[PDB]
Structure formats: C-alpha cells, structure tokens
Write a protein that binds this ligand. Structure first.
Ligand SMILES: C=C(C)[C@]12C[C@@H](C)[C@@]34O[C@](Cc5ccccc5)(O[C@@H]1[C@@H]3C=C(COC(=O)Cc1ccc(O)c(OC)c1)C[C@]1(O)C(=O)C(C)=C[C@@H]41)O2
Ligand SMILES: CCCCCCCCCCCCC(=O)O[C@@H](COC(=O)CCC)COP(=O)(O)O[C@H]1[C@H](O)[C@@H](O)[C@@H](O)[C@@H](O)[C@@H]1O
Ligand code: NA
Lengths: 537, 80, 79, 67, 80
C-alpha cells in the first residue's frame, strides 16, 4: 500500500474496485488481499477545503458507494476472506453511514443509495440474523438514521422511515407495515422507534435542533410519518399547554402595562409606598413584572447553555430567543436604574414594554394562518425592509446634508431638524416650504422635488413591488418554517412537561410481526395511518 | 397584527409621557393611529424626559407599521 | 448613444466631479453661487454610494432595478 | 420587477466582472499575483515532441452517472 | 455576442490522438464520481489585446447576449 500521508492505505484492491474490474478484485482476494484494508490518507477524507472523496475507507464501503452490487456481494460472501459487514472506519462509520454520507438528494444519486442500502440490509439479515446494523453508532454517536436526519439527506430519510420489505426473513427489517386491508382502504403502521423518543438522537430532536446550516431542515418534516406524528402530538397534548402559556403571557403583559401606566410622577425613585389600595396593587404589579423579567432572563440563559450557538448560529437563527432575552435585559436594567435613584429607568422600562407587546407575535405559531403570516413578516423584515432601509437612509442623509448646507442661520440649520423634516415626506406630512432661511430658492426647491420623486415616488412604490415579488415566492417556504416552529414548540413542551406525564408518548405499543429472527415477538410502538386507493386492487 | 403593534407602542409612549395633554391611553392610541392615515404629527408632545426615547419609539412604530405592514398588506392582497 | 444607454454610473460620478469643479471656480470668482453647485455635488455624492452595492447580490440587484425603473417607468409616468 | 428579476441577476454578475477588471488594470502596486491559476503541463505532446504549459484553471466536478 | 460558439470553444475537448492538443478542457485525474478538469485560460485571463473578459465586460452594450456570456462555466468560476 501507499505509505505517504496523502494516499495512505490505498492498496491494489481499492484500485481494482475503483476501476470496476471484477476480475482483478477476484484475483486479489484469491491471493490474500486484506479486505479490511483502510484507505486513511488525507485524500480519502471529507476535508471540504481540499480535493478528495470520502467513502468510509474500506473496500466494502467503496463498492457500496460506487454502485457495484456484484462486488459487494462477492466481498461479503467469498470463500477466501469474507468482509466484515459491521466494520467501522476511523470515524466509526459503517457501510451504511457511508451510504448516508455520499447522499446528496439528487434523483439518480438517491435511487442507487436507497437501493444499495436496502440490499446491504437484506444481506446483513441473511448472513447475520442476530446483527442489527442500523443501531451501530459512529464516533459522533449517530446511527445512520440519525446521521441522515442531521445531515439533511431528505431522500435517504424518506426512504428509511417508510421502508417496507415484502419477503420472508426480511419482514422484521421493515418500518412500514400493513395491518389490515379491506376494499380500497387499508391501515398501515409506521414503526416510530427512535423518531418519537430514544436515548440521544431522536429524529425529531435532530431535525428541530439542527444547526441552521443543514440543507433541508425545513423540508424534512414533510416526510409522512413525521408530519402526522407532530399533528397528533399537537392535538392530543400540546395545544392546551401552548394556549395556557399564551394566556399567562397575556396576563403578564397586562399586569406590566398597568403597573407601568400608573407609575408615580415625582422625581428620584424609589418611591415610598403609600398605605392605600391602589398603591398596593401597583407595587404588586411591579413585583410581578420584575419577576417575569427574571424568568425570561433565566430562560434565555438556559437556552444559550443548552444549545451553545457559536456566535453566528446565535444570531442568524433563533430570533425569538434573542427578543425575549433582550426584553428581560431591559427589564433588569430598569430595576437597577430604579434602585440607583435614576429617572432613566423609565427609558429602559418602556423599551421592554414595547418589546413585550411585539413579542406577543411569538404566539402566532399554533395558528396556521397567523403563524404563516408571522413568518412572512419575519422574512419581509429580514430581506426587504433591511435592503430598503439601507438605500432609503443613504438618500435621506444625502439630501439632508445638502439642504442643511444650503440653509444658513435658520431655525432648522442642523442635521437632526432637517433629517426629521425630510423624513416627514415619507409619512405623508412633508411641509415642502418649511423654511426660507436661504439664498437660491430655486436650488432648495429643486433639491426637495428631487428628494420627493426619488424616495416618495420611486422607492416606496418599488418597495411595494418587491414585497409583492417576495410573497409570491415564500408561500411554501413560509409554511415549512411555520411547521418547524411548531415542531420546536412541541419538543420544548414535552421536554419541560412539568408533571412527569407519560401520555406524551403516543402511538400505542402494537405487535408488528411477532416473529423476529429468533422466536421472540416484536412490539414496536407503531403509529397508525389509514389510506384509500382506487387502483391496484 | 396591526392592533398588537399599535397597542404596544401606544402603551410605551403614554408611559413615557407624564402630566401632559395626552397622558392617556385613548389620546395616544388615536395620535399614533394618525400615522396610519398619513397624518402622524411626530412631535405631538414634549411632556416627557428623554426625547431620544420618544422619537426612537415613534420611528420604530412607523417603520414597523407604516412601511412594513401596510405595504405588506398591499402585497398580500395582490397575491390573494 | 452608447454614452447614455449604458455605463450610467460613470456618467453620474463624472457629473458629481463637474459640480465640484464648477463650485471651485465660483468660489474663487467671488460668487456666493458656489454653494448652489456644492450641494448638488454633495447630494449626488451620497447617492453615488449606491454604486458600491455592486458586488452584493441582493443589494446590487436592488440598485439595478432602481436604474431600470428610472429609465423606463419613472420617465413615462413623469411625462 | 417580475419581468427583470433574472436580467437583474445577470447584470449584477456583469458589473462585478467590470469591477474585477478595473481593479486588475489599475493595481497601483505592480502586483503580478493577479495572474492566477498556475502554469500546468496539460498534454505534454504538442505536434512536435515538446510539452505545452498553458496556465490552466482547476475545476472539480462530481457525477453519479456514466460510471 | 455569439454565446453558442463561445460556449463550445471555451470547454472544447477532443478525444483522439494528434488532436488532444487542440482541446481547451483537459481531465487531469479521475476517481469514481469525482474528477478534476483543467480549463485552458489562454486568451481568457490575459493576452496581448483582446482578452475575452475585456471584450465581454467592455462590450458596446449592443452585443445581444453580453449579460449571459459570463455564465459560461470557466468564466464564472474564474471571476469568482
Ligand atoms: C440620469 C441623470 C444622469 C440624472 C443625474 C442627476 C441630475 C440626478 O438627476 C437625474 C434626473 C432626475 C431628477 C429628479 C428626479 C429623478 C431623476 O437623474 C439622474 C440622477 C438621479 C439620481 C439617481 O440616483 C441613483 O441612480 C443612484 C445610483 C444607482 C445606480 C448606479 O449604478 C449609480 O452609480 C453611481 C448610482 C440621483 C441624482 O444624481 C441626485 O442625487 C441629484 C441631486 C439629482 C439626481 O439626472
Ligand atoms: C423596540 C421594538 C423592536 C421590535 C423589533 C422586532 C419586531 C418583530 C417582532 C416580531 C416577533 C416575532 C418573534 O418573536 O420572532 C420571530 C422573528 O422575527 C424577526 O424577524 C426579528 C427580527 C429582528 C420568529 O423568530 P424564530 O425563533 O421563530 O426564528 C425562526 C426559527 O425559530 C426557525 O427555526 C427558522 O430557523 C427560521 O429561519 C427562524 O427565523
Ligand atoms: Na398626509
């Protein structure tokens, strides 16, 4: 084999398989070639910034990754040296992990990846009935299903979750079963082991808590059993708890609003408590408001520690956590300033109050129409409003600087006053003759007319046009993002759960086959789905 | 959504205002609603402290409702 | 005809510079009208900042659309 | 805008190219590293026995068909 | 602006003896699904007078397809 670091471990068997030469592979195996020889040079690793090709480093995984079924079969069941189907590479990946790794969700790639995955499972059952390949974890602790979910390989995931195998001695490998079928109607069963709940890498958790860079994280929940399962969890368990949370938050904001509205107006806090009913209610509301601020503060800390976003994932995703945390930050700063005998606490408090009400839109998830609407609002802010505000502020500042330069020794004669006065045109209140303290009136009026045409006439209508272009394109994306938002809500509710309730585990424990490779019977927590079809009687 | 934003910023502004003509949820709500119909004063009171906070709240309200939400409404009606 | 139908960014930068230079001449000619030129340079200068939104796909496409709108729709509407 | 979205994408790529060329032509420092892609031997067989070095630019591709 | 002919030429590859040298796209090494190509770039990046990039970018704006010609693979990747 090669001994240089770049091609380290490559041997003649790797080249023979790479060349698709069955004869040379047979010859090399006959002559004592090592079928477990790992090609662990740098070239055969992921290493996105360098050329290479990762395939799991092993000849069996090399054949499987290159759509060479004949070589796979030969390597597994040759006489001279059978290959270890359960072998693991330097990363801990088996052949199935490698098949997941090479997936890229294109039709032709997915086709052979799913087929080769299926064939390997069939052969593994036939050669090693007691072996459970799909439960093997690599060094990251990920099974092939968990790896597929985390990497966004939606095609592989969609294959696995509804895999149905119609033959003896491989029925127990299925995850989709048909319990009864009467006329056109039949009731199928989806397995749900390691989807709903498991040790670490539940598929729902892996998708929901993905790092925002996974390619298909919004689309993965469209795979049938997952969408139905989340709807079931919602309706049965989470709808009520979410509504209760929303109600409590509304009460919180009402108390905060009332406590703030009736603040005393004398200088220099803190204010002596007067021995009257209104003041006991006011101070009670203040204590509850500060309490809620502390609560959201600690929830924000818990989120940060439990996720550990890496300072870019911290901001490009999870806006709602940031907004609730910032609200609580304003509340705490308000408390500090209040007891520091500074009136500026009011400045803090109102910001929190404003944020407190706008964060009410968080709860528009849990309603499909409003949730999708709120997602569209989010995307408008992030795309169109940000672009528009950059361009608009460039124009506004440029013409404000020109006009304030033209004005001399006037009332306005300042960047703030002139910027405000020109901004008034945008909101339909522009004076258009707000000062005469200049020379060259023609220049002044020309500048104002150019500003009006460029911003009021051109840019705002252009903003409307671009928002129209955007909504036309983000319908399906918005629905998918809302579904993901509700999925995260469901998982967080069930991980909190506040009562040690076991009913959150849905779907019921049914017997699928009752005949594993040994005599034991298999109960596998299936989820029932009825279907009807008027063809293929 | 518009009423949520309107009420939130109305409560913030009227909390900031003290001992003024407005200083009341109704008057401030009406005065902010005037922005929607293109009559928002943007300097309707000075009975406060922290002018920067007052103007920041109004600019945020205008940007979120007038510029974003109304134009978004036109876009969505066009789609519908 | 090529001078106007395309390469309109360079024309705008050049016009800014012309306004600046006329401002200089009027400044040393002892005429207060230099201010009139200077502000047109100044405003135009800030607007030419949008040239540098090239090299960003989103902002650049936005500024391209502004150019196209000004050429077609704003002119027809203004007539 | 619904009619010029795509034309706008193409125009953006165009004027980024223009910026690139203007930067390389000005360069203000006598920098020769702007000549990228490296001088590789392509074929090694010209019509005579000589070998050809042609400043080639490397582009990796991946295909899951036509094995 | 003859984008079709340009698209042919820039990635021209001829598979026979004594016509390999006419190619402008060469395949250096290949593995399974991965392989690394080499584009010629003579008279694209730089040359005496008429670099293809200079000709396209400084087109007269009456060239039919000037916006699209930079989409041809080696050009776009080179510009990036
Ligand atoms: C098209 C010509 C060259 C133009 C040059 C000047 C006079 C201009 O007035 C116009 C005529 C005009 C006047 C009033 C309203 C609209 C248009 O529009 C532009 C021109 C209109 C512009 C438009 O701003 C832009 O196009 C920004 C921009 C977009 C794309 C670019 O590639 C760019 O390169 C710098 C700049 C701004 C002004 O230069 C400006 O700021 C002033 C004070 C008047 C505008 O003449
Ligand atoms: C002084 C007053 C200022 C108020 C300014 C702010 C007004 C808007 C307030 C509206 C409240 C809505 C909300 O509470 O947050 C919205 C975000 O709205 C914004 O755009 C804020 C821009 C800053 C949804 O946040 P979300 O957590 O759902 O983010 C999604 C992920 O969850 C999901 O997994 C996906 O990854 C998806 O790509 C993510 O987006
Ligand atoms: Na008005």
């Amino acid at each position: 084999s090669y001994t240089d670091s770049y091609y380290k471990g490559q041997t003649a068997l790797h080249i023979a398989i790479e060349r698709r030469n069955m004869t040379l592979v047979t010859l090399l195996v006959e002559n004592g070639a090592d079928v477990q020889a790992a090609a662990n040079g740098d070239f055969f690793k992921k290493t996105k910034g360098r050329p290479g090709f990762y395939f799991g480093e092993l000849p069996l995984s090399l054949a499987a990754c290159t759509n060479q079924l004949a070589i796979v079969k030969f390597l597994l069941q040759n006489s001279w040296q059978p290959a270890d189907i359960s072998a693991r590479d330097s990363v801990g990946n088996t052949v199935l992990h490698a098949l997941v790794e090479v997936a890229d969700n294109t039709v032709d790639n997915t086709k052979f990846v799913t087929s080769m995955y299926n064939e390997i499972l069939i052969l593994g059952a036939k050669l090693h009935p007691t072996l459970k390949l799909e439960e093997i974890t690599n060094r990251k602790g990920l099974t092939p299903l968990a790896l597929a979910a985390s990497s966004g390989k939606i095609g592989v995931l969609a294959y696995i979750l509804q895999r149905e195998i119609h033959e003896p001695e491989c029925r127990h490998l299925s995850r989709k079963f048909t319990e009864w079928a009467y006329g056109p109607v039949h009731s199928s069963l989806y397995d749900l082991s390691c989807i709903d709940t498991c040790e670490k890498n539940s598929v729902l958790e892996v998708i929901a808590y993905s790092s925002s860079e996974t390619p298909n994280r919004h689309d993965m929940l469209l795979v049938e059993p997952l969408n139905r399962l989340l709807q079931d969890k919602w309706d049965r368990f989470v709808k009520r708890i979410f509504y209760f949370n929303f109600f409590v938050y509304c009460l919180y904001m009402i108390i905060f609003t009332a406590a703030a509205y009736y603040r005393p107006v004398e200088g220099l806090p803190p204010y002596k408590l007067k021995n009257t009913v209104g003041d006991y209610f006011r101070v009670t509301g203040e204590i509850l408001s500060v309490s809620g601020g502390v609560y959201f503060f600690f929830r924000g800390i818990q989120y940060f520690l439990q996720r550990r976003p890496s300072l870019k994932s911290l901001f490009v995703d999870s806006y709602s956590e940031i907004l609730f945390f910032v609200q609580s930050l304003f509340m705490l700063v308000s408390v500090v300033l209040y007891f520091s005998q500074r009136k500026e606490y009011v400045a803090s408090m109102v910001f929190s109050l404003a944020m407190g009400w706008t964060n009410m839109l968080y709860y528009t998830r849990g309603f499909q129409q409003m949730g999708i609407y709120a997602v569209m609002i989010e995307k408008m802010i992030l795309r169109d409003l940000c672009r528009f505000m950059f361009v608009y502020l460039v124009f506004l500042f440029g013409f404000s600087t020109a006009v304030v330069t033209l004005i001399e020794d006037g009332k306005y004669n300042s960047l703030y006053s002139t910027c405000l006065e020109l901004f008034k045109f945008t909101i339909g209140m522009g004076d258009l003759e707000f000062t005469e303290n200049y020379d060259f009136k023609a220049v002044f009026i020309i500048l104002l007319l150019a500003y009006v045409i460029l911003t009021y006439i051109l840019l705002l209508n252009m903003l409307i046009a671009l928002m129209g272009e955007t909504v036309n394109k983000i319908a399906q994306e918005s629905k998918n993002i809302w579904k993901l938002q509700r999925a995260i809500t469901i998982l967080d509710t069930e991980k909190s759960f506040l009562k040690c309730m076991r009913k959150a585990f849905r779907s019921g424990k049914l017997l699928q086959v009752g005949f594993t490779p040994d005599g034991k019977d298999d109960y596998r927590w299936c989820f029932r789905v009825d279907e009807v079809n008027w063809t293929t009687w």
